[PDB]
Design a protein around this ligand. Structure first.
Ligand SMILES: CC(=O)N[C@@H]1[C@@H](O)[C@H](O[C@@H]2O[C@H](CO)[C@H](O)[C@H](O[C@]3(C(=O)O)C[C@H](O)[C@@H](NC(C)=O)[C@H]([C@H](O)[C@H](O)COC(C)=O)O3)[C@H]2O)[C@@H](CO)O[C@H]1O
Ligand SMILES: CC(=O)N[C@@H]1[C@@H](O)[C@H](O[C@@H]2O[C@H](CO)[C@H](O)[C@H](O[C@]3(C(=O)O)C[C@H](O)[C@@H](NC(C)=O)[C@H]([C@H](O)[C@H](O)COC(C)=O)O3)[C@H]2O)[C@@H](CO)O[C@H]1O
Ligand SMILES: CC(=O)N[C@@H]1[C@@H](O)[C@H](O[C@@H]2O[C@H](CO)[C@H](O)[C@H](O[C@]3(C(=O)O)C[C@H](O)[C@@H](NC(C)=O)[C@H]([C@H](O)[C@H](O)COC(C)=O)O3)[C@H]2O)[C@@H](CO)O[C@H]1O
Ligand SMILES: CC(=O)N[C@@H]1[C@@H](O)[C@H](O[C@@H]2O[C@H](CO)[C@H](O)[C@H](O[C@]3(C(=O)O)C[C@H](O)[C@@H](NC(C)=O)[C@H]([C@H](O)[C@H](O)COC(C)=O)O3)[C@H]2O)[C@@H](CO)O[C@H]1O
Ligand SMILES: CC(=O)N[C@@H]1[C@@H](O)[C@H](O[C@@H]2O[C@H](CO)[C@H](O)[C@H](O[C@]3(C(=O)O)C[C@H](O)[C@@H](NC(C)=O)[C@H]([C@H](O)[C@H](O)COC(C)=O)O3)[C@H]2O)[C@@H](CO)O[C@H]1O
Lengths: 114, 114, 114, 114, 114
């Protein structure tokens, strides 16, 4: 598997606006919120939980890269795979998206799979 | 278990104002204090111990997040599980609360379980 | 093997312009895009992939160093080994270049092999 | 054992003046120096040594926390256990104080065992 | 062995001018160049190789301490042991000096072995 599989969803020109970290089922997890840098669209919520999903190996690098991007506030493309999380109250608070990639976006192009 | 369980407590629009690191019983641990962004209400102290309680496997993420929210001074929702730590002079100095989550807060809302 | 083997290629006076982090084939990975400080020449793309290639041991060090040199926008020499990644989609989204070294530069020389 | 044990000694309103990193008999170590924020008293020196003494599990948590309080220069409470390091030249260079905790100090009381 | 053995060599009031990360013989390594803050004297180049020499255990501590001092630009004392590294293409580019510790320096004194 790869972040750039067309079986994943991505969203260009996003700013990570909120950040949460917590625990579920003996696993640490974090979620981010992103909103469009130009005020449009609707927000995207994605999580990563450290020992679940096929994306578990990525957890610490994702979290670290989320934390960095969140602090600079730059334009980023956000990559997810839908319909991964299953605890109903959890997906209610956040969503069922699994974070799978982050790409910095210039004003013209983004630096990730497309 | 889950950070967002209803058996836990949360306190919104807090800002982390104190941070302390030590060791207890061969265990790294940290403690934070939080005060209302407006300065009213009663402070919240919560603690994480790296080898103890169901919440140990998230020790370092929570430390890393508590540190980041500590430096920015931003307003956050802090989540605890009360009546966890039992060494009475530890508890007297700090709390019986286990830290189990940290969410960023917008002025709108906070990005965490309710 | 060594970063400064003549079987490797390097590009001085570059600026890490873009950063992407993702997961491929159970490995967390990152790529960078470096531009000549002025606008000259063609960009170079280079990836490091946890647990993959002979350069795997250096993954975390090159990821932290890249994060730094990218936060500063300072001049660097970037060292690569060509034709390492073989997945044609990944190679077309990025490059086959394995990142193998990163050097700061002053106004005259860069601090690394050449 | 605990940072807060009355058999341990501590110092309020310190600022981490210096920071040093080295190795001694197999172990990475670091030493800090603190002086009172008002100029009073005499400097405190404290060291932590990896894989050595009962405080060894805290080495990296304590180093990260020492680095951070160093970078900010904020007022802190340093907790130590005295007479731990015996290496005569090392102690004459720094001290035999083993670093057992770090506490933030704000307008009101220092956040830690008192 | 100890950073401050008089069989080692040190230079005070230096600034970390350049940083390089790379890999050699399956081992991440890094090197630094230091110049007198007053401009006097000749640079010192020192390196740490994560798998080799008796200073291996402190590889990561020194890496983290070098990166911090390099980012503040503050004056330091660098300690090295001469004539450690043997591979001539490596020593010709950098040095045979192994990095063995780092101290922060006042305008009057350095906090470390003399
Ligand atoms: C000139 C003009 O008027 N352009 C606007 C645009 O606002 C908008 O185009 C956006 O910018 C780029 C190209 O113009 C990108 O292609 C965007 O396309 C994607 C993206 O984010 O990269 C493609 C991606 O596959 C889509 N993701 C999914 C799951 O379908 C997303 C997504 O559809 C949007 O970002 C919306 O996301 C949310 C949650 O709101 O877009 C593109 O957004 C263009 C859109 O058609 O409308 C023009 O008017
Ligand atoms: C197409 C199809 O329907 N195939 C079916 C599956 O629907 C079916 O579903 C799985 O059954 C398992 C047996 O209980 C599990 O319950 C699966 O859900 C869990 C899991 O254990 O893996 C339940 C668990 O509570 C979840 N944890 C959290 C924090 O939410 C996990 C977790 O969500 C996932 O591990 C991570 O996300 C994913 C999707 O990877 O999901 C359940 O899906 C299964 C047999 O019952 O196989 C086919 O028969
Ligand atoms: C009077 C008495 O000891 N009764 C106990 C039961 O309570 C006991 O479960 C224990 O509760 C104790 C206090 O009532 C201690 O918490 C026990 O051990 C420690 C531990 O080391 O694990 C002691 C230690 O002081 C505690 N650390 C701190 C910072 O307070 C820890 C820590 O609190 C643990 O995480 C427990 O907290 C929770 C809710 O998980 O507990 C603890 O075992 C039971 C078996 O011990 O039967 C009686 O002996
Ligand atoms: C005699 C005197 O000091 N008079 C006043 C004091 O009111 C006050 O002195 C210090 O004020 C601090 C509060 O900000 C602390 O209360 C000091 O108590 C401690 C401390 O640092 O917490 C208590 C601690 O137990 C002591 N540690 C040890 C090993 O004994 C330390 C220590 O004695 C001092 O920090 C000095 O140590 C060194 C190396 O310098 O003190 C309290 O003493 C302060 C208010 O203005 O100054 C005087 O005016
Ligand atoms: C006011 C002004 O313009 N300049 C002064 C200088 O006089 C001063 O020079 C330094 O003064 C220091 C404190 O007095 C030390 O004496 C320095 O000597 C050492 C050192 O770095 O610690 C002593 C040390 O033992 C020597 N190391 C070895 C292996 O011999 C080194 C070494 O010789 C030098 O660093 C030169 O090395 C190279 C390759 O360049 O010197 C002394 O340098 C100045 C700081 O340089 O700051 C002002 O106070």
């Amino acid at each position: 598997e790869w972040t750039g599989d067309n079986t994943n969803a991505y969203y260009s020109d996003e700013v990570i606006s909120e950040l949460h970290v917590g625990q579920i089922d003996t696993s640490p997890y974090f979620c981010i919120k992103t909103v469009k840098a130009n005020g449009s669209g609707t927000p995207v919520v994605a999580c990563a939980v450290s020992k679940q999903s096929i994306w578990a190996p990525s957890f610490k690098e994702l979290l670290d890269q989320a934390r960095y991007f969140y602090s600079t506030g730059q334009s980023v493309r956000i990559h997810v795979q839908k319909n991964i999380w299953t605890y109903p109250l959890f997906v209610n608070t956040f969503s069922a998206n699994a974070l799978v990639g982050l790409s910095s976006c210039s004003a013209t192009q983004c630096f990730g799979p497309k």
